[PDB]
Amino acid sequence: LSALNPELVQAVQHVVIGPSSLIVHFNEVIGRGHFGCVYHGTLLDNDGKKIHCAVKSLNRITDIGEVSQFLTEGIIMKDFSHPNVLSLLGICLRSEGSPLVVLPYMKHGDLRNFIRNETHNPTVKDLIGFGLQVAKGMKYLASKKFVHRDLAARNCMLDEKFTVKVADFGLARDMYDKEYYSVTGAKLPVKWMALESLQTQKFTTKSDVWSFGVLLWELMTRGAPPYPDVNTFDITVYLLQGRRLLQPEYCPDPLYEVMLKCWHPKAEMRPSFSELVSRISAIFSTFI
Numbered sequence: 095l096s097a098l099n100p101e102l103v104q105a106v107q108h109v110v111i112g113p114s115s116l117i118v119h120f121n122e123v124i125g126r127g128h129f130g131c132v133y134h135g136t137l138l139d140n141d142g143k144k145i146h147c148a149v150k151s152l153n154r155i156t157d158i159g160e161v162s163q164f165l166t167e168g169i170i171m172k173d174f175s176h177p178n179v180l181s182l183l184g185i186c187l188r189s190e191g192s193p194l195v196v197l198p199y200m201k202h203g204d205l206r207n208f209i210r211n212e213t214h215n216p217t218v219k220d221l222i223g224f225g226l227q228v229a230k231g232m233k234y235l236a237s238k239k240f241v242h243r244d245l246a247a248r249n250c251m252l253d254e255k256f257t258v259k260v261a262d263f264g265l266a267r268d269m270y271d272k273e274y275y276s277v278t279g280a281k282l283p284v285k286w287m288a289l290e291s292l293q294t295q296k297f298t299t300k301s302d303v304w305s306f307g308v309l310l311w312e313l314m315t316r317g318a319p320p321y322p323d324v325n326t327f328d329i330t331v332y333l334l335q336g337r338r339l340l341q342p343e344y345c346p347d348p349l350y351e352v353m354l355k356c357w358h359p360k361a362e363m364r365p366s367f368s369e370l371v372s373r374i375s376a377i378f379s380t381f382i
């Protein structure tokens with residue numbers, strides 16, 4: 095760590111959490127990604143109050159350049175701030191399990207597992223509401239010209255107030271369910287990817303809009319896997335033939351129309367996230 099560029103160390107200073115401010119419970123894994131396990135922790139603010147944290151210990155870092163890019167990404171990630179986007183609380187360098195990524199604890203876990211849980215009954219309105227929250231988080235990310243590239247219900251989280259946070263980006267980027275990825279060394283979430291992305295491996299905000307349409311379909315089916323009867327390797331031709339996900343039984347017509355628009359073959363014809371927020375707000379307001 096003494097081998098790092100000192101100016102980079104100074105640049106990341108405001109992101110760093112000292113070990114005397116952090117308690118991590120390393121004996122119980124609360125989440126698993128390909129690139130690291132997550133543990134519960136408590137972070138002490140300057141008032142002495144406790145903030146519950148998810149602390150992720152990154153594996154497979156081998157060289158200073160990777161460490162340097164880790165720090166660089168921590169810096170930009172710290173600058174993101176929106177109620178529907180997962181925040182970076184900080185990183186802990188002087189610890190066992192270093193480097194540690196310190197994120198807010200998400201009481202209700204990932205959105206996909208949440209809606210699949212049979213013991214609760216979110217209403218159609220609640221489910222549309224989760225989609226609206228995701229649209230607002232994406233509207234923010236897109237306004238900063240950030241492209242997520244892996245938007246899906248599995249990659250959004252829910253906190254104790256049922257606020258949805260777009261997650262799985264920056265230092266929190268991972269594969270959290272390897273079943274849905276095919277491996278440039280590119281790991282591709284094929285069934286969420288826009289047609290042009292499948293063909294060229296290029297990604298844009300409009301390809302995020304495509305993924306958002308699939309996410310809406312996930313919400314309306316309460317977490318069904320998309321295209322269950324289509325093999326991963328066959329999705330591209332499926333789409334080129336003029337086929338799309340079918341309308342879920344309890345998906346209102348205007349929302350299925352929104353989904354269809356998100357999957358338009360021409361990227362420029364897809365709605366913006368600002369348009370999605372406005373239209374989905376209207377649809378949401380018609381329930382109950």
Ligand SMILES: Fc1ccc(-c2cnc3nnc(C(F)(F)c4ccc5ncccc5c4)n3n2)cc1
Nearest residue numbers: 124125132148199200204248249261262266270
């Ligand atoms: F089964 C699954 C499926 C997905 C995820 C998932 C998805 N996106 C993420 N972005 N960051 C994280 C994370 F691992 F850092 C995290 C952040 C807060 C948590 N709060 C409480 C408990 C686990 C937490 C994990 N994820 N995780 C985790 C499990």
